[PDB]
């Protein structure tokens, strides 16, 4: 269903303004400042470790979540930290890139939701006792 044409128009205005403030050393919100920090930790992660992203592995919509819920379980098998959370995110990005490489676009919407609910039910806790997101921003910003 379609929402407000004004909420649409406001959402873009609000996006283009944060970006300009983040560049000039400001931030619209804690959410805005965290997003950009993760975007850049991500590219930094991509750069440092491009080798390990290659062709990852019978990717079909069939056993997609199954094969997914297991890699992540294994990822944090013995604990969370700021680097594994980044390792976590960058992992979803390639899945989404490699998926649309097979028109399996339909797999992208589902992927997002597996992360959001995992990060909510499992990553969210750690993150919270360990300083918060504000703390990440400091370690990983710029």
């Amino acid at each position: 269903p379609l929402g407000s044409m004004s909420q649409s128009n406001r959402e873009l205005v609000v996006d283009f303004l944060s970006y300009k403030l983040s560049q000039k050393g400001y931030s619209w919100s804690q959410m805005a400042a965290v997003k950009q920090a993760l975007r850049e930790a991500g590219d930094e992660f991509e750069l440092r470790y491009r080798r390990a992203f290659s062709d990852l592995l019978h990717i079909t919509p069939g056993t997609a979540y199954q094969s997914f819920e297991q890699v992540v379980n294994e990822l944090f098998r013995d604990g969370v930290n700021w680097g594994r959370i980044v390792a976590f995110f960058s992992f979803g990005g390639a899945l989404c890139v490699e998926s649309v490489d097979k028109e399996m676009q339909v797999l992208v919407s589902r992927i997002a939701a597996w992360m959001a609910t995992y990060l909510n039910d499992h990553l969210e806790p750690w993150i919270q006792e360990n300083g918060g997101w504000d703390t990440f921003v400091e370690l990983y910003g710029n």
Partner: peptide, 23 residues
Amino acid sequence: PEIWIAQEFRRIGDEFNAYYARR
């Protein structure tokens, strides 16, 4: 197959964590 990859992501994601942790 997979398991080895999850392990790999645990590793490089630690080298990374180590980096910004040392800073």
